[PDB]
CSV table of C-alpha atoms in Angstrom, one decimal:
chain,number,residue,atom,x,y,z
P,1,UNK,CA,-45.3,-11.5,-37.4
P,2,UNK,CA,-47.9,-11.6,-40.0
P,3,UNK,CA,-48.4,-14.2,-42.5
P,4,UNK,CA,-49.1,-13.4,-46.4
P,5,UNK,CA,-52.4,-14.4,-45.5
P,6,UNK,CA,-53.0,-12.2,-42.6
P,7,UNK,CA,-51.3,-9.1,-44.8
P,8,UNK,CA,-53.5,-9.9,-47.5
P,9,UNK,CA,-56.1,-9.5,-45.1
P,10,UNK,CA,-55.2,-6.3,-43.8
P,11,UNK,CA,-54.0,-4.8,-47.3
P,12,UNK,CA,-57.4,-5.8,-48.6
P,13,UNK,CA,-59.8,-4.5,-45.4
P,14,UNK,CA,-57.8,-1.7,-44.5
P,15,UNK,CA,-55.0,-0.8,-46.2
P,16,UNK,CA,-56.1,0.1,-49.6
P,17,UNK,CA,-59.4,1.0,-48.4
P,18,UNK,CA,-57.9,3.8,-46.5
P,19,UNK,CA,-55.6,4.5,-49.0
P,20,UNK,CA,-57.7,5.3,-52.0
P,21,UNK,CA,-60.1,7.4,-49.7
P,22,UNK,CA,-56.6,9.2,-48.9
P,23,UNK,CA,-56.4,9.5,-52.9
P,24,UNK,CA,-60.0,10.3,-52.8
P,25,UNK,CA,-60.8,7.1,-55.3
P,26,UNK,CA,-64.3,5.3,-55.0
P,27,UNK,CA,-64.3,1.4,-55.9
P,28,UNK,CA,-65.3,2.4,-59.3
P,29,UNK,CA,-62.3,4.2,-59.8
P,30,UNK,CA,-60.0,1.6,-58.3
P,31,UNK,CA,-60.5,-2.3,-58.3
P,32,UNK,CA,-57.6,-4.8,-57.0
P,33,UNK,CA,-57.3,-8.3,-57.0
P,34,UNK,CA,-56.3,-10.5,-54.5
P,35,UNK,CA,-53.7,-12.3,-56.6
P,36,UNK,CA,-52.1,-8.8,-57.2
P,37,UNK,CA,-51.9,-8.0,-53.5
P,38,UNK,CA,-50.4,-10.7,-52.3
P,39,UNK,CA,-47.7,-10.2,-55.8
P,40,UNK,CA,-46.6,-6.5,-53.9
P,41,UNK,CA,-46.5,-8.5,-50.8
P,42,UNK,CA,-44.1,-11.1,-52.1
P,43,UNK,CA,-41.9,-8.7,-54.4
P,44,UNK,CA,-42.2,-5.8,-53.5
P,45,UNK,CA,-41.9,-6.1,-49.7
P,46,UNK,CA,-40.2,-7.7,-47.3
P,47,UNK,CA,-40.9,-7.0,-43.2
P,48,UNK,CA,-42.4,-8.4,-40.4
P,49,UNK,CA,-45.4,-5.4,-40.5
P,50,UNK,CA,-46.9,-3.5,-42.5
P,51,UNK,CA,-44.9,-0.3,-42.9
P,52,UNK,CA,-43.8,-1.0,-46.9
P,53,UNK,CA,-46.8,-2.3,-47.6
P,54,UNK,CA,-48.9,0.7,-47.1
P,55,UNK,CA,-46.2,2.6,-48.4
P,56,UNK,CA,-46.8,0.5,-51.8
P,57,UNK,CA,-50.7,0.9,-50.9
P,58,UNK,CA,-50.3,4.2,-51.2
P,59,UNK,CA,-48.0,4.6,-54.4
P,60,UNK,CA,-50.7,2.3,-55.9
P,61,UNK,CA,-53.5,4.8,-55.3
P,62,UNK,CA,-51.2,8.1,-56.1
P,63,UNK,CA,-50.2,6.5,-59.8
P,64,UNK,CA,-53.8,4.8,-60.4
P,65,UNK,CA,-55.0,8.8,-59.4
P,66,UNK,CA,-52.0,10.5,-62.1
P,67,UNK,CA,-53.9,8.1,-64.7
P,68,UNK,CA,-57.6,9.6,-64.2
P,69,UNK,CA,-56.0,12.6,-63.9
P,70,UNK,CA,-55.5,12.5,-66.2
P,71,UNK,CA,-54.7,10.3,-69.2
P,72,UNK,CA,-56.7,6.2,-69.5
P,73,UNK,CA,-58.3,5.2,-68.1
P,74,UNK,CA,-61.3,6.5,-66.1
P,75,UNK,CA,-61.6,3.5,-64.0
P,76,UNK,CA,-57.9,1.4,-62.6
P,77,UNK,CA,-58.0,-2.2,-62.6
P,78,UNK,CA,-54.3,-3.8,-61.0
P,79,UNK,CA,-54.1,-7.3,-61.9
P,80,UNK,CA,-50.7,-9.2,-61.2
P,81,UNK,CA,-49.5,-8.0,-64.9
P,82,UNK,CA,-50.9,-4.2,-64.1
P,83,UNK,CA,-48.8,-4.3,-60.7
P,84,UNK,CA,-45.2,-4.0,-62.5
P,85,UNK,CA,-45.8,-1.4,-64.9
P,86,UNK,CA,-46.7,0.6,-61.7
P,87,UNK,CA,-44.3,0.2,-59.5
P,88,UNK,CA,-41.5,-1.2,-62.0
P,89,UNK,CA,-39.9,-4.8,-61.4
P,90,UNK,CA,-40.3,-7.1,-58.9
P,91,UNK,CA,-37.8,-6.0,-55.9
P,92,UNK,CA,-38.2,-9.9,-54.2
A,1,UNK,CA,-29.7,26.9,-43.2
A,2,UNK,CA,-32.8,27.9,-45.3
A,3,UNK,CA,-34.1,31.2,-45.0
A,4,UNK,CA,-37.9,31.6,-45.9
A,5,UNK,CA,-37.2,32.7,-48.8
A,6,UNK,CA,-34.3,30.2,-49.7
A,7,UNK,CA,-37.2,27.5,-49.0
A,8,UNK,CA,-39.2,29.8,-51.5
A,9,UNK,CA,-37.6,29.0,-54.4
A,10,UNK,CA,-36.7,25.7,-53.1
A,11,UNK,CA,-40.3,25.1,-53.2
A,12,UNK,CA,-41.6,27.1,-56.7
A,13,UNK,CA,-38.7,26.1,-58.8
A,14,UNK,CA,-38.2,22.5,-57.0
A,15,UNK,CA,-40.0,20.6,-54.5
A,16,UNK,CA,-43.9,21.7,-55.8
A,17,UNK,CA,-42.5,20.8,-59.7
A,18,UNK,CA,-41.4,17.6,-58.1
A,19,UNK,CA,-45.0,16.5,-56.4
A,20,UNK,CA,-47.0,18.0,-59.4
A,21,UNK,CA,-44.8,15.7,-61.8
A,22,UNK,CA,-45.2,12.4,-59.0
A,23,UNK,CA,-49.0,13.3,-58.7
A,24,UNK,CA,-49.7,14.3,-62.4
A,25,UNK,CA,-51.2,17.3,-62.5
A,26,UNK,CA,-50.0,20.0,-64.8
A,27,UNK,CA,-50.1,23.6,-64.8
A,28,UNK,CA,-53.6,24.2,-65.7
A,29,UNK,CA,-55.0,21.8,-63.0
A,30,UNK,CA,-52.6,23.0,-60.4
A,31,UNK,CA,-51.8,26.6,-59.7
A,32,UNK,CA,-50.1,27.8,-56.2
A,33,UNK,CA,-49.4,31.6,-55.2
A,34,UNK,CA,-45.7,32.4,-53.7
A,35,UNK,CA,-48.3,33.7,-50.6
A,36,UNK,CA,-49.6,30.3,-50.2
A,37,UNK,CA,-45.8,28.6,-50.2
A,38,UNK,CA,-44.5,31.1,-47.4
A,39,UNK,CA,-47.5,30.7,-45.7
A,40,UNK,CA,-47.2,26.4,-45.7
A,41,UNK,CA,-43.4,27.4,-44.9
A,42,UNK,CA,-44.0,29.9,-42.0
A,43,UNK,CA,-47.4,28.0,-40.5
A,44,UNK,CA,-46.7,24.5,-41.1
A,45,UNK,CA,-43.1,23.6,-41.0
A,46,UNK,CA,-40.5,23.8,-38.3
A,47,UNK,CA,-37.5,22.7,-39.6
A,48,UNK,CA,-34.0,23.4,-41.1
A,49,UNK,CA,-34.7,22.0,-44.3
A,50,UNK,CA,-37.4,21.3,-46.6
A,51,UNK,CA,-37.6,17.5,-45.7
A,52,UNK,CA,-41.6,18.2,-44.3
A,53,UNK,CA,-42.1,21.1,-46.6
A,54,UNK,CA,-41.8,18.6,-49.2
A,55,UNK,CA,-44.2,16.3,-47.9
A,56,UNK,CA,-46.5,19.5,-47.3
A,57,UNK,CA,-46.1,19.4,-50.7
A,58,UNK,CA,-46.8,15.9,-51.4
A,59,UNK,CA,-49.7,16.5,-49.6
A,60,UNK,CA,-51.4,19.6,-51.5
A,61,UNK,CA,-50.7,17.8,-54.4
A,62,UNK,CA,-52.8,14.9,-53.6
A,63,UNK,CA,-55.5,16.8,-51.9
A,64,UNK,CA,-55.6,18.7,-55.4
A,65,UNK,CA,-55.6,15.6,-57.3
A,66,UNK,CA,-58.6,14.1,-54.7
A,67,UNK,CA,-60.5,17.6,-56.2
A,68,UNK,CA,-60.3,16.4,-59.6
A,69,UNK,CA,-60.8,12.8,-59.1
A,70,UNK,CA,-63.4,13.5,-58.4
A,71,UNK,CA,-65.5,16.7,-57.2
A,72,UNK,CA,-65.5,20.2,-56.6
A,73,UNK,CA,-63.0,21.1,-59.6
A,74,UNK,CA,-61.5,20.8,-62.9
A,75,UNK,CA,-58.0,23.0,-61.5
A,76,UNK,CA,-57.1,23.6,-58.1
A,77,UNK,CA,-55.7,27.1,-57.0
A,78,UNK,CA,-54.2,27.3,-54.1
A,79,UNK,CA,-53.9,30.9,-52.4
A,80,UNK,CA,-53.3,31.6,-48.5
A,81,UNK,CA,-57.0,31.4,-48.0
A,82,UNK,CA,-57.5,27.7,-49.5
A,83,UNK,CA,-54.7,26.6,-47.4
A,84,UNK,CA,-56.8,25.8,-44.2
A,85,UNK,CA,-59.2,23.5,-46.9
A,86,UNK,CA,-56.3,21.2,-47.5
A,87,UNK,CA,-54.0,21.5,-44.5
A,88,UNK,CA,-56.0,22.9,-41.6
A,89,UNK,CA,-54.8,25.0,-38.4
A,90,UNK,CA,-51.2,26.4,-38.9
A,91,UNK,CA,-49.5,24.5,-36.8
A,92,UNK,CA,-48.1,27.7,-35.0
């Protein structure tokens, strides 16, 4: 159904932008790059929608969330390297 | 299967520890009443199990968590009353 491309869309416009409001994280609390998106896509998901992927969306927000509450930082950043130590190894 | 007050302990001694641990918070940044558990148990839940109870759960936990990241406070206690603040109309 979707392409990487049209995921990466909807992970970056509404996905994560709902989720972290659902976390209750402003963009200075969380920041993702595009490069690590389309990483969960690939690895850690595999489906024709959109179901895992906000499931993933979500886990990202939760664990970025246990770190400012509490631990370091005070602001999440999720680069392709952050991405694995939170949510472990690549499944894909 | 679970009596109320089976799910009681089910949810003290289990599925709350659980969420707390999955959402980070600790002791001193969530407290919750036995009152408050029977009450998401009673008003919220219709079930044989705890399968939504847990995601009640889930879900105080990262309404609390919202709280602290960021707003209103520092630790989250949840009694009957604060229920409605995170969870609304008892859905019964």
């Amino acid at each position: 159904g979707y392409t990487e491309l049209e995921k990466l869309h909807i992970m970056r416009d509404y996905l994560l932008p709902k989720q972290m409001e659902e976390h209750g994280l402003g963009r200075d609390k969380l920041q993702m790059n595009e490069e690590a998106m389309l990483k969960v896509i690939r690895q850690y998901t595999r489906e024709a929608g959109v179901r895992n992927l906000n499931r993933e969306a979500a886990n990202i927000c939760r664990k970025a969330a246990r770190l400012i509450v509490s631990g370091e930082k005070k602001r999440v950043v999720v680069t392709p390297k952050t991405v694995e130590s939170l949510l472990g190894k690549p499944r894909y």
